[PDB]
Amino acid sequence: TYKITVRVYQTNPDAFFHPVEKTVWKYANGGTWTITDDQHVLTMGGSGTSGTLRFHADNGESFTATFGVHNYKRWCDIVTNLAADETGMVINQQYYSQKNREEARERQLSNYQVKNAKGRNFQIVYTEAEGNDLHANLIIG
Amino acid sequence: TYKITVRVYQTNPDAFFHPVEKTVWKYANGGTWTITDDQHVLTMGGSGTSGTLRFHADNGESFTATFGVHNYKRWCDIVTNLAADETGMVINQQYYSQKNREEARERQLSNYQVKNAKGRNFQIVYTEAEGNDLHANLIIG
């Protein structure tokens, strides 16, 4: 089993985001998104799968944060330029079908940040980046 | 906009189910799963899409409950006995690709029930079953 526990930090009062979708890809016997003490916990049956959280703000901004394990190491990716028909479940599957997304996954990043077109920053940093009990902060700018 | 507000009733203390995935299909400008007073609220951009809740019990039982609107009428379906690689995102997309699931959506049911292999009943009943502000009970036996 691999677990990734995510703590969400919102740093900027000009917006407020909230989770609107939580998906789990089908490889490695799947897994679950659960909540313990205000943290989102992705539990997966083995290496090679992942799960996507999609966040939406009142003002229309949105992004996906995807977390998983590839070849026994954590990975993550943030997508901020979501097409009109790119829900979380669409994005999560693309990591196993679209080359650019497959490459983002296979980089096994333990830290990544990117901005949206409005200039807001989003960051995922794993503070426990090793082993089977992984911990990451999702930090919204 | 269509909204489906879901209340989960668990009637049988021999198991405890809890939500482990919530997905939104990409048609009709997608939508969101939010929570208001322990109710799961699926808000959709218009008719023609849907969203899936997956529930797991710590005893191994699991099922998906999918809610949506097809040609302006609500629909619903429950799938039980899920395989390890049938996560909620896999099931949700099946309503637009797999024949028996497409037919289930086309039925535009205001209520549906089914049992799993163990004999446990699962039912969806829309208590507000018309118009744009729909309400359903998901009742686990």
Residue numbers in the entry:
A (entry chain B), B (entry chain A): 1 to 141
What do the paper's sentences say?
Sclerotium rolfsii lectin (SRL) is a cell wall-associated developmental–stage specific lectin secreted from the soil–born pathogenic fungus. SRL displays a clear specificity for TF and its substituted glycan structures. In the current study we report two recombinant variants SSR1 and SSR2, generated by the deliberate changes of the amino acids incorporated at particular sites of SRL by the synthetic gene construct method based on the complete amino acid sequence of SRL. Interestingly, SSR1 and SSR2 the two different variants of SRL, differ in their glycan specificity.
Apart from the carbohydrate binding site residues other deliberate replacement of the amino acid is incorporated between SRL and SSR1 at 14th, 113th and 123rd positions, where the amino acids Asn, Glu and Glu residues were replaced by Asp, Gln and Gln, respectively. The crystal structures of SSR1 and SSR2 lectins in their free form were determined at 1.7 Å and 1.6 Å resolution, respectively. Like SRL there are two protein molecules (named mol A and mol B) in the crystallographic asymmetric unit of both variants related by a non-crystallographic two-fold symmetry. The mutations of SSR1 (N14D, E113Q, E123Q) and SSR2 (T1V, N14D, T34S, E113Q, E123Q) were all identified and all atoms of the mutated residues were well defined within the electron density map. Overall the crystal structures of SSR1 and SSR2 are similar to the SRL structure and the introduction of the mutations did not seem to affect the overall structure of the protein. Only, the mutation N14D seems to cause a minor disturbance in the loop region of residues 12–14 in both variants (rms displacement of all atoms 0.18 Å and 0.26 Å from the SRL structure, respectively). The most profound conformational difference is on SSR1 and especially on the side chain of Asn81 which moves away by 5 Å from its position in the SRL structure towards the secondary carbohydrate binding site. The adoption of this conformation of Asn81 in SSR1 is made possible by a shift of the entire loop encompassing residues 81–86 by 3.0 Å on average, from their positions in the SRL structure. The glycan array analysis of the variants demonstrated that SSR1 recognizes TF antigen and its derivatives with high affinity like SRL but showed the highest affinity towards the sialylated Tn antigen, unlike SRL.
